[PDB]
Ligand binder design. Structure first.
Ligand SMILES: [N-]=[N+]=NCCCCn1cnc2c(N)ncnc21
Ligand SMILES: [N-]=[N+]=NCCCCn1cnc2c(N)ncnc21
Ligand SMILES: [N-]=[N+]=NCCCCn1cnc2c(N)ncnc21
Ligand SMILES: [N-]=[N+]=NCCCCn1cnc2c(N)ncnc21
Lengths: 260, 260, 260, 260
């Protein structure tokens, strides 16, 4: 059973990484960042996202685990001083795997798929943002504002939360769309409410004038030219976590936003 | 196969009801409001809610169908002039049944269960509303404001929508909690975001000073004294609709809030 | 120069009141709760509101001052341990007076005026809340929801803030109206945005079906039957504070909601 | 008394412009786009903003007037078919001038002032947006989100409205700040409520890491590097409108967002 460990690169996370590799050396555990089976993130949630995207082609073969050196994270939910007990149970242990749903983002020109852990956003490159929203091949609305954000269940606690979106429990295979500063007068009308779509529903964005958009998936932001369709749906692929303890999602929400 | 038809009582809905009973008389269809198998609502969504609560003890044995004489409703989605084609297919037809999730509300003193189609709300009888929120036996927050609203998937388009809640597709077995004018300063903290809970999750409300609350289930509002716990969870019971046509939930949302 | 002191009634505020009366006795300062010139509140903001409404017929003749025994308040902005220095400067001192705007609320039947320090709210007695909104004799909208709240500048930090309202600086003679869980579909339309009205603007509420409303002014809540019009405007009367120090309104907002 | 007329450039507005110049030729009215006294905008609100910024150095010497060829605008509030009656009263008439407040935006490096009619916004060039907010030389908060928007009274109906801001009547000399998708957890805290500042209050933005910002004034968007301070305050300069009729601001709000 192979493993690898990424670090935030600062003074604290690098020294915590070298002490776990030394601890993992007392066990016959091979370090392999090429085709690992246990990926360990040390730092914050952004480090976990980078660690996730580094191996998004082997999601079935990998069980993730995150350690937080700064604040408490939603994916990095392991205190740094608890690493020695983590190394012990992650070696000689069987534990159990927990899986979360993911978001597929398809872009067509005149196809490019993506996998997101938190959210995927769309904005305009310069001019005003105007798109028609199609839900299962039915025109629902014509949005105009700053943009739109489609979130995963676990990602509702991120950017989705800042846009008024609802926090969904990760056991629900769904995706949530939220609006960014839309225009609503007697002429232009958007729904306003966040929308939650189940598995096997397809939300499609279609341009109306400008065909250049600034699509961002998680932290990765990029620019697309002459875009024909942006296609959202819940991915069949799932991330796999490795849990040694009961840390409820609703408890992580509490400690992060209420008090801890 | 028995049937019954409730009416809004006005001049328009009563005459539409008598023309369907006459149409149903050409077929060997017995009218029975005691133990029917097909309940028909004529009027609005409020008439459908009353028709629902009139037979919430025979939900498996009943397939509902609603006709709207005023506006377009979410449960009453059949144009009045389409009643003759409805009577024809509802008699000699097999159609297909569609089921939505429901909400169970338990109240304990020193137990009383309820079934809601839209939402269940809690407020205080006079004084300020203060409750502790417990999620699966874990204290999540101490709310203080006007009250709280727990919504069903199909009920997100009602009161839940007015509170900033997200609109969920009815195929998702879940419930959504939304806040009513909460207080948030450096001392008192609520989450603010609407919360979506899956099946088999229990949200419990517990008093902090006053033990009298104005609990309302759908339209039925009542007052409870010396309350110990308000217990929410997704009911195992489901309502059964009878669909003769493709009318997507997202299309009903469009026609009701965008344009029609 | 006469004075009086009200108390929250608890063990802490009553003992703090008797130590100031003893301190005020070393000076030739007459205690008079009939026609005072300096009203002192000890406890919280609710105690200050009661102290305000106890003498709302002598607002020009009174300069208010509040002490907070619990949390920090917006009107009770004096630490309890700073009472001896307060008694000293309030006796032999000239200080300076600060004035805030107030809200006039007129109710007509088939007239009853009120003065509010924070806000005045309107709801329905049982049935749905439906009112037409008239602004300077021009029909602006037909509201339907839970109710409406009209706030004073200093009251924007209270109930107005919980309804999404903006926080106005008290030096602005204005009033702010905010909506309570309104209904908005393709048929019924409200503005949604909080509205800020200047001096000499009249916002009038007019019933549409039910003519019974639960009008509340600050903490005082009451019920009115067969109501014809609810009339809002900025009062010409102003409350008078007595400031010995620089405590900016924006600083009080910071300490109350950010950190202190 | 000189005059000039700008056009949207389309087929409809250009032909409406040439018919007014011909009408203004029957009167001894000199056309002068260098130093006019009456500026006329034909098209939309964006055309009025460009017409405003074309002469923001002669605001006292100019009384503006806008005609709308597309929708109804807030600054272009004159029906196209009413141009002949406009030309008549604008020539031989005295009318009356109406003045609105404006927003001053100062940027310092290691000064550049601006005048806005609607709003001024700040965002980050790439990285996360983090700024400290200083109000009259007092640190109020440390914002982190997408950005911030400071609005004028008449501009509250634009971008400010899309951010949850309140609509202020133009007779109030003030400015309103609204937040753009801020982050709020147990660590990072923003006020959330829109803030309304009176005349002679200074809101200052100060960077925390990145010193490059995408400042936008009305429609004009630009990029600033190595920024030290962004300084907001209500300008002493005021725009001057020329009104021939009673068109209340609250009525323009009604026709634009409710119905017309
Ligand atoms: N991109 N970036 N950097 C900002 C990272 C902010 C914290 N954060 C990242 N993911 C999150 C998540 N799923 N739930 C809650 N909080 C999260
Ligand atoms: N109680 N009551 N009367 C007011 C009824 C208002 C309309 N309405 C009722 N249920 C609804 C629902 N599920 N989705 C959308 N709209 C609904
Ligand atoms: N009614 N009551 N009790 C609840 C009192 C809550 C605190 N509070 C009262 N006035 C306030 C005000 N103007 N600004 C901020 N906070 C205020
Ligand atoms: N920049 N740009 N183009 C978009 C212009 C949108 C309409 N609009 C411009 N100013 C406005 C204002 N003060 N109140 C309301 N609506 C306004």
């Amino acid at each position: 059973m192979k493993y690898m460990i990424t670090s935030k690169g600062d003074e604290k996370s690098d020294l915590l990484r070298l002490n776990m590799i030394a601890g993992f050396g007392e066990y016959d555990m091979e370090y392999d960042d090429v085709e690992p089976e246990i990926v360990i993130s040390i730092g914050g949630d952004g480090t976990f996202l980078s660690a996730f995207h580094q191996y998004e082609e082997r999601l079935d073969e990998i069980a993730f685990i995150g350690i937080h050196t700064g604040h408490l994270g939603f994916y990095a939910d392991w205190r740094p001083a608890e690493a020695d007990k983590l190394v012990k149970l992650l070696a000689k242990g069987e534990y159990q795997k927990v899986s979360y749903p993911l978001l597929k983002t398809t872009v067509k020109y005149g196809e490019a798929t993506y996998l997101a852990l938190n959210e995927s956003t769309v904005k305009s490159s310069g001019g005003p943002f105007v798109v028609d929203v199609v839900i299962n091949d039915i025109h629902f609305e014509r949005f105009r504002g700053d943009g739109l954000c489609m979130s995963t269940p676990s990602g509702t606690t991120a950017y989705n939360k800042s846009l008024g979106g609802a926090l969904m429990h990760p056991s629900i295979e769904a995706m949530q769309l939220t609006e960014m500063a839309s225009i609503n007068n007697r002429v232009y009308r958007t729904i306003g409410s966040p929308l939650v779509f189940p598995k096997h529903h397809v939300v499609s964005l279609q341009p109306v004038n400008d065909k250049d958009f600034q699509i961002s998936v998680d932290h990765l932001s990029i620019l697309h030219r002459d875009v024909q369709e942006i296609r959202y749906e819940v991915s069949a692929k799932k991330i796999h976590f490795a849990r040694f303890r009961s840390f409820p999602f609703w408890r992580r929400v509490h400690d992060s936003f209420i008090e801890d």
